[PDB]
Design a protein around this ligand. Structure first.
Ligand code: CPS
Ligand code: RET
Ligand code: R16
Ligand code: D12
Ligand code: D12
Ligand code: D12
Ligand code: D10
Ligand code: D10
Ligand code: OCT
Length: 226
């Protein structure tokens, strides 16, 4: 009965219901282009649902000694993010017809971001936790830079309605993704200022917005149709 369980339960509900709704809508669509966006976007909260559910049931949690104490760390978050973050970037790349080499570079950077974040989260020497955090944050900023400058440039060649939908999704992505390193820094994995229950609340609001919110915006747009 960990106090953060309530937010894990609410995250589970929200991701579950989001997945179900996207699946129902997606299965009804016949346009092949729209179907690809549905397939990618439905998978995102589906993966998050399984990881939130696992954490709700007491899995994906480990104790890491640092700063003279035994600290609880939810590593299952990284398993979710390893797969869902590149899927979200793929949605954006597909909207703007980004180059294959750009997608490869972003997916590589994304793997670095999640992998070094996880190594950070598991590191037993307090100061070194922040070296890995800094490397992960640098990878994230490379991603946001490309999604902001590179993808907008590509969007300028698309019809205005596709460009408009892209810009809303780009803006949501920049605002939400840039919060994650700060929550990590001040929370359980970092400085230990924000207690685990509140941190779990914060990550739940961010996760639901970045996956279900993002998905609602994308999947209700005419932009996904070919
Ligand atoms: C019975 C099993 C395994 C026991 C070993 C234990 C281990 C983790 C437990 C859940 C979580 O703690 C979160 C939550 C706390 C609420 O208080 C009551 C409900 C809930 C869903 C718990 C139910 C149950 O107790 C679980 C599944
Ligand atoms: C659905 C989940 C989303 C959109 C998650 C995004 C998560 C990140 C951008 C995480 C970034 C991190 C850093 C920038 C450094 C510290 C650890 C990471 C994983 C939290
Ligand atoms: C023409 C070139 C150059 C370069 C580059 C710049 C630098 C740096 C950094 C950082 C960050 C971020 C992010 C973005 C976005 C919204
Ligand atoms: C006393 C010592 C040193 C430390 C640290 C810091 C460097 C912070 C640079 C952050 C780059 C992302
Ligand atoms: C005596 C100490 C030294 C240190 C520090 C630091 C500055 C490193 C800044 C790195 C920025 C990327
Ligand atoms: C598209 C060619 C540019 C490739 C740059 C790859 C980059 C970077 C990464 C990251 C991390 C710390
Ligand atoms: C893939 C990036 C690997 C960078 C290694 C840096 C070593 C950190 C010293 C604690
Ligand atoms: C001794 C702590 C400083 C380690 C610096 C690691 C450099 C990271 C390379 C990207
Ligand atoms: C806006 C948050 C500031 C409060 C941080 C905390 C603590 C003592």
């Amino acid at each position: 009965g960990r106090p953060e369980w309530i937010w894990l339960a609410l995250g589970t509900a929200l991701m579950g219901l989001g997945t179900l709704y996207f699946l129902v809508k997606g299965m009804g669509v016949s346009d092949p282009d729209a179907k690809k966006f549905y397939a990618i976007t439905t998978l995102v909260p589906a993966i998050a649902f399984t990881m939130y559910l696992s954490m709700l049931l007491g899995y994906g949690l480990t104790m890491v000694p640092f700063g003279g104490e035994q600290n609880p760390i939810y590593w299952a978050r990284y398993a979710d993010w390893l797969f869902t973050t590149p899927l979200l970037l793929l949605d954006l790349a597909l909207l703007v017809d980004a180059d294959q080499g750009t997608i490869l570079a972003l997916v590589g950077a994304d793997g670095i971001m999640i992998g070094t974040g996880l190594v950070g989260a598991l590191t037993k020497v307090y100061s070194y936790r922040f070296v890995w955090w800094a490397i992960s944050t640098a990878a994230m900023l490379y991603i946001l830079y490309v999604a902001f400058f590179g993808f907008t440039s590509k969007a300028e060649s698309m019809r205005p309605e596709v460009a408009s939908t892209f810009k809303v999704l780009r803006n949501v992505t920049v605002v939400l993704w840039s919060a994650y390193p700060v929550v990590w820094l001040i929370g359980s994995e970092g400085a230990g200022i924000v207690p685990l229950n509140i941190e779990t609340l914060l990550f739940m609001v961010l996760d639901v917005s970045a996956k279900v919110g993002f998905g609602l915006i994308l999947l209700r747009s005419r932009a996904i149709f070919g």
